[PDB]
Amino acid sequence: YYSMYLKEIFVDNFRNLKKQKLEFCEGVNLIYGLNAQGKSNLLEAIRLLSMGRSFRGSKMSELVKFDEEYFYVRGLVRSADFYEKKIEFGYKVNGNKVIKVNGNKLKSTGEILGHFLTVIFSPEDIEIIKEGPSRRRKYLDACISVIDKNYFFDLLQYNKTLSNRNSLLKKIKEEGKGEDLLEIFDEKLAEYGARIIKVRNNYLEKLKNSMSKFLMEISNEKLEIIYLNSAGVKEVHEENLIREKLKNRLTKSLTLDLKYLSTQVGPHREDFKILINGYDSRVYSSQGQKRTAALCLKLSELEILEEETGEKPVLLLDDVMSELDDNRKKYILKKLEGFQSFITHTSKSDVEGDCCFKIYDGIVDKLA
Amino acid sequence: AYYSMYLKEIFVDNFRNLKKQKLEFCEGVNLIYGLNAQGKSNLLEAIRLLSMGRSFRGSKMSELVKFDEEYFYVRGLVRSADFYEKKIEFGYKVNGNKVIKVNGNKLKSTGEILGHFLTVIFSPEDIEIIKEGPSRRRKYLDACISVIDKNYFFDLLQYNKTLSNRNSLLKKIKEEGKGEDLLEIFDEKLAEYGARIIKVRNNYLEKLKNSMSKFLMEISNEKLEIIYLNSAGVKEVHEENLIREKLKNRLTKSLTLDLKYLSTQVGPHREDFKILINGYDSRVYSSQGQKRTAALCLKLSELEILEEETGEKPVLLLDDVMSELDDNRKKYILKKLEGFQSFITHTSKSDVEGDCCFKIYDGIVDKL
Ligand SMILES: Nc1ncnc2c1ncn2[C@@H]1O[C@H](COP(=O)(O)OP(=O)(O)OP(=O)(O)O)[C@@H](O)[C@H]1O
Ligand SMILES: Nc1ncnc2c1ncn2[C@@H]1O[C@H](COP(=O)(O)OP(=O)(O)OP(=O)(O)O)[C@@H](O)[C@H]1O
Ligand SMILES: [Mg+2]
Ligand SMILES: [Mg+2]
């Protein structure tokens, strides 16, 4: 076995939170407080060790406590083949992200991906159903990159090239009516986009299969995922084929690209649709049935993460115990066995955690 | 004591999942209840359509049409302070034809429906006003004001019309030459309208500030302040004579920017107002329930202001706002609802048991 595990966390100058070191027990860490406390703030610091950014999309500026110049998070983690691993996040108001794993500072922020695995269940996950393709596309990358460093690299390269190619368009439109030498980037974008498309396709087939079963078991509704990729393909097939399609679309779209100084073809503007019972759930569905869609989305994220990486993530549940009754809660609890849980709530006298913490002014306090 | 706004009956034909029917409601608390995805919000949406001329959810007209149909039609009979029974009729055929009639008479422009039937709608998706972009806020401010202020709503139409006008001149200046002369006037026009909007917007925001504080004070004890980032940088001013120049002013300085982006950059279509809670911008730093509180307050204040500037007393649409309560506020605000017509959606018949209650299933509403 040997599942993941946040042994302890130390946070200095982090958001609301006073400077403190907290030790956690594996299983369910109930955390209760009241809107000026830092429940979500703790959960944030924890995921920061996992992704190296805020799950609430916040600037690393705002993580820094009011009127300070820096903040520091340290965490002690057990992987499956790691008895103990130290992850360190430090930021100063200079603009210096510093990230050490076992004393060894990391080259780029992205290398923090993988060392500590979390799945964060936020009620704001509902936005992946509701917002535009940008929100869904980001989410998609985040799911894959935590599983596949290859995909991550390709993304980064892809964007660099895209950004270069955009500059080159600017100069072409204005300073010289013709560069064919735009050809070299088109070729590069096509070659990278195709690998990106081919991997996204691979993830989404899994999400189809996985979410379908959840969506079916939960509410008897038929799930369907439609990947709106840049190749314009219904089935995905050969990476080579995608490469040739992307390149062509890139040639035929030049004019539009010169009108806008943007690149219209490419995985930087794909999207997937989530059809519940044949209809777009972004356009046609009940609040409650968007909620359910988002829930199965998260379930599948987790299920796939265990499947692909042999590890069992640390589950963070922020403000979900609210929307539930009593037998529906211990039901959920029972599904959380093999996992270390960090669960925020608002009452202690309700859900019985393997150890729990009251939090009042930014100070965590065990067994209360 | 004037007669409250009161919705006697509604007829819906081909409106979302809702069957063809005519329902008759109570002066008082109409409790609409049912399982989810049955049509409670749809129904609430049809109501507010009569009040607002569009979907409160932002959906587009074509999507309101029942699936695989050619039109939809809604009829309301309302009692205002000066009316015993007013007909408001709304129809849309999927050829894009919008048709509104009040008491038989087809209205000239859709906007003219504003003010006849007065509703205030409270949904959980009100949080978004606190924590999305300047779009969401600017727009909700426009909606709030235009309902009370027929005049402003005309100002606004005329602003966006010559704004769009101006931006098409920009695509004929740095693209095709000349255009210099004709440019002079638009700036005067944009500045004339703009300053109307600004004075009025400021008016409402001062009222918003005052009312909201009083609420936010009573409810969570936090201190509210409100900053109106007007387009004329004239923080803390009140005389339209001068704001016209500043806009005419800033509109010249930003000429080359304007030309670079082919958009206009200075005016009230780029404004926003910040909702500070205890000194801190709540877009950025507020908690979650800290926004649930900020939202409810925003709404409460809307209702309050609305009552006192129209001399009416709106219908209250309470969309799925009652799941998340404690019975010490659920049996409370029920008392607060007394003088008004409430539509309250829920999923349980058991005690939110107001003055009347219908049960909806499969788009059909029966009365117990
Ligand atoms: N940089 C910061 N410095 C200090 N406090 C901050 C900072 N950013 C956010 N906060 C504060 O954190 C406080 C509450 O923390 P958090 O954001 O975790 O809410 P919460 O206690 O989890 O409550 P809820 O149940 O409402 O989610 C808020 O009052 C907010 O102003
Ligand atoms: N144009 C349409 N034609 C047919 N059905 C639609 C249309 N638009 C939305 N629906 C469907 O209406 C059903 C219910 O809509 P609505 O949002 O009113 O559900 P709801 O009753 O609000 O859910 P809840 O019961 O949680 O309030 C959903 O299944 C939705 O997919
Ligand atoms: Mg929270
Ligand atoms: Mg709904």
Q: Which atom of ligand 2 is nearest to the CA of B34?
A: 25
Last residue of a domain, one of B314, B329, B359: B314
What own/partner pairs with CB < 8 Å and gap ≥ 24 does A167-174 have?
A: A169/A257, A169/A258, A169/A261, A169/A262, A169/A263, A170/A261, A172/A258, A173/A258, A173/A261
In the PDB record, what is the listed experimental method? X-ray
Q: Which helix (H) or strand (E) holds B210?
A: helix B180-220
For residue B38, what is the nearest residue in chain A, using CA coordinates?
Answer: A286
Where b means 16+ CB within 10 Å and e means fewer, B130-159 reads bbeeeeebbeebbebbbbbbeebbebbeeb
What does the alpha-carbon distance between residue A192 and residue A268 come to, in Å, rounded to a whole number? 11
Q: Same domain, yes or no, for A247 and A107? A: no
Say if residues B314 and B118 touch (Cβ distance below 8 Å): yes
Query: What's at B204, amino acid-wise?
Result: Y
Claim to verify: residue B167 and residue B100 sit in the same structural domain: no
Partners of B34 on chain A (C-beta within 8 Å) are: none
A7 and A69 both lie in a single domain: yes
- Measured CA to CA in angstroms, residue B22 lies from A31, B49, B86, B302 at distances of 49, 16, 16, 30
Both A268 and A340 in one domain: the answer is no
B41 touches chain A (CB under 8 A): yes
Are A121 and A301 in contact by the 8 Å Cβ rule? The answer is no
State the number of CA atoms in the 13 A half-sphere of B223 facing the CB: 3
Structure tokens, B83? 């009316």
For ligand 2, whether the C-beta of A287 sits within 6 Å is yes
How many domains are contained in chain B? 2
Greatest alpha-carbon pair distance for chain B in Å reads: 71
B287–A36 CB contact, under 8 Å = yes
Q: Which amino acid is at A257?
A: D
Give the contacts of A71 (CB within 8 A, at least 6 positions apart): A11, A12, A13, A14, A15, A63, A64, A65, A90, A91
> Which residues in B14-108 belong to E strands, given as ranges?
21-24, 29-33, 71-79, 86-93, 97-102, 105-106
Window 251-310 of A, Cβ < 8 Å to B: 283-289
CA separation for the pair B187, B192 (Å, rounded): 8
Contacts of B274 (CB under 8 A, 6+ apart): B226, B227, B229, B281, B283
Same domain flag for A308 and A353: no
Task: Say whether B260 counts as a known binding-site residue.
Answer: no
The DSSP 8-state label assigned to residue B65 in this structure reads B
A38 annotated binding-site participant: yes
The reply to whether A144 and A255 lie within a common domain is yes
The closest alpha carbon to B170, from B248, B256, B269, belongs to B256
Q: Please, are residues A87 and A74 in contact by the beta-carbon 8 Å criterion? A: yes
Residues A232 and A343 in one domain: no
Residue of chain B nearest A280, judged by CA positions: B63
SS3 B73: strand
Q: Phi, psi at residue A199, to the nearest 5°?
A: -80, -50
Cα of B142 vs its chain's centroid, Å? 7
For A221, other C-beta atoms within 10 Å of its C-beta total 18
Distance (Å, rounded) from C-alpha A51 to C-alpha A111? 9
| DSSP H or E segment with residue B247 | helix B240-253
Q: Is B69 in the pocket of ligand 2 (CB under 6 A)?
A: no
Interacting residues of B244 by C-beta distance below 8 A, sequence separation 6+: B191, B192, B194, B195
Residue nearest atom 16 of ligand 2, based on CA coordinates: B39
Question: Of ligand 2's atoms, which has the minimum distance to the CA of residue B40?
Answer: 21
Long-range contact set of residues A255-260: C-beta below 8 Å, sequence gap at least 24? A257/A169, A258/A169, A258/A172, A258/A173
Q: Contact, B74 vs B10, CB < 8 A?
A: yes
Q: Please return the burial class of A315, using the count of CB atoms within 10 Å of its CB with bins 0-12, 13-18 and 19+.
A: buried
Strands of the sheet containing A85-92, edge to edge, are A20-23, A6-12, A70-77, A85-92, A96-101, A104-105
Closest CA to A24 of A285, A352, A340: A340
Place of tokens 């409601």: B25
- Would you call A40 and B320 a contact, using CB atoms and an 8 Å cutoff? no
Say what angle helices B134-148 and B180-220 make with each other, to 10 degrees: 90
**CB contact set of B103 (below 8 Å; sequence gap of 6+):** B86, B87
Distance from residue B191's CA to the centre of ligand 1 (Å): 41
Q: Mapping DSSP to helix (H, G, I), strand (E, B) and coil, where does residue B18 land?
A: coil
Q: Is B278 in the pocket of ligand 1 (CB under 6 A)?
A: no
User: What is the distance between the alpha carbons of residues B12 and B19, in angstroms, rounded to a whole number?
Assistant: 8
Q: Which two tokens stand for residue B134?
A: 């300047």
Give the position of tokens 């108001």.
Answer: A93
CA distance A53 to B306: 42
Do both A327 and A368 map to the same domain? yes
Is residue A299 located within the same domain as residue A322?
no
Residue B272 vs residues A138, B147, B287: alpha-carbon distances, Å: 27, 19, 21
Give pairs for B96-101: CB < 8 Å, separation 24+.
Answer: B96/B61, B98/B61, B100/B53
Structural domain that includes position B194: 125-314
Residue of A112, A121, A120 lying closest to A145 (CA atoms): A112
B40 is in an annotated binding site: yes
Q: Is B124 on the interface with A (CB under 8 A)?
A: yes
DSSP state of B80: -
Q: Are B347 and B353 in contact (CB under 8 A)?
A: no
Distance from CA of A266 to the nearest CA of B (A): 23
Alpha carbons B251 and B232: distance in angstroms, whole number: 10
CB of B62 less than 8 A from some CB of A: no
CB-CB contact of B238 with B202 (8 Å): yes
Beta carbon pairs, A and B, within 8 Å: 33
Structure tokens at B354: 């107001």
Residue holding tokens 């569009």? B54
B295, B359: one domain: no
Q: Resolution of the deposited coordinates, in angstroms?
A: 3.0
Top mutation candidate among A41, A71, A72 for ligand 1, by most atoms within 8 Å of CB: A41
Last residue of a domain, one of A277, A294, A313: A313
Q: What single-letter amino acid sits at B152? A: Y
Question: Cα separation of B207 and B302, whole Å?
Answer: 9
Amino acid code (one letter) for B210: N
Same domain membership, residue A92 and residue A18:
yes
Q: Binding site annotation covers A39?
A: yes
- What is the CA(B349)–ligand 4 centre distance, in A? 17
Least CA distance to A40: which residue of chain B?
A: B287
Q: Any residues with CB less than 8 A from the CB of B257 and at least 6 apart, and which?
A: B265
Long-range pairs of A214-219 with CB within 8 A, sequence gap ≥ 24: A214/A295, A214/A296, A214/A299, A214/A300, A215/A276, A215/A292, A215/A293, A215/A296, A218/A292, A218/A295, A218/A296, A219/A289, A219/A292
Q: Are residues B119 and B138 in the same domain?
A: no
Ligand 2 atom closest to the CA of B44, numbered from 1: 18
User: Could you tell me the sign of the dihedral formed by the alpha carbons of B183, B189, B194, B199, in that order?
Assistant: positive
Q: Write the secondary structure of chain A as one string of H (helix), E (strand) and C (coil).
A: CCCCCEEEEEEECECCCCCEEEECCCCEEEEECCCCCCHHHHHHHHHHHHHCCCCCCCCHHHHECCCCCEEEEEEEECCCCCCCEEEEEEEECCCEEEEEECCEECCCHHHHCCCCCEEEECHHHHHHHHCCHHHHHHHHHHHHHCCCHHHHHHHHHHHHHHHHHHHHHHHHHHHCCCCCCCHHHHHHHHHHHHHHHHHHHHHHHHHHHHHHHHHHHHHCCCEEEEEECCCCCCCCCCHHHHHHHHHHHHHHCHHHHHHHCCCCCCHHHCEEEEEECCEECCCCCCHHHHHHHHHHHHHHHHHHHHHHCCCCCEEEECCCHHHCCCHHHHHHHHHCCCCCEEEEECCCCCCCCCEEEEECCCCEEECC
Are A142 and A337 a contacting pair, CB within 8 Å? no
The helix or strand, by DSSP H or E, that contains position B12, with its residue range, turns out to be strand B6-13
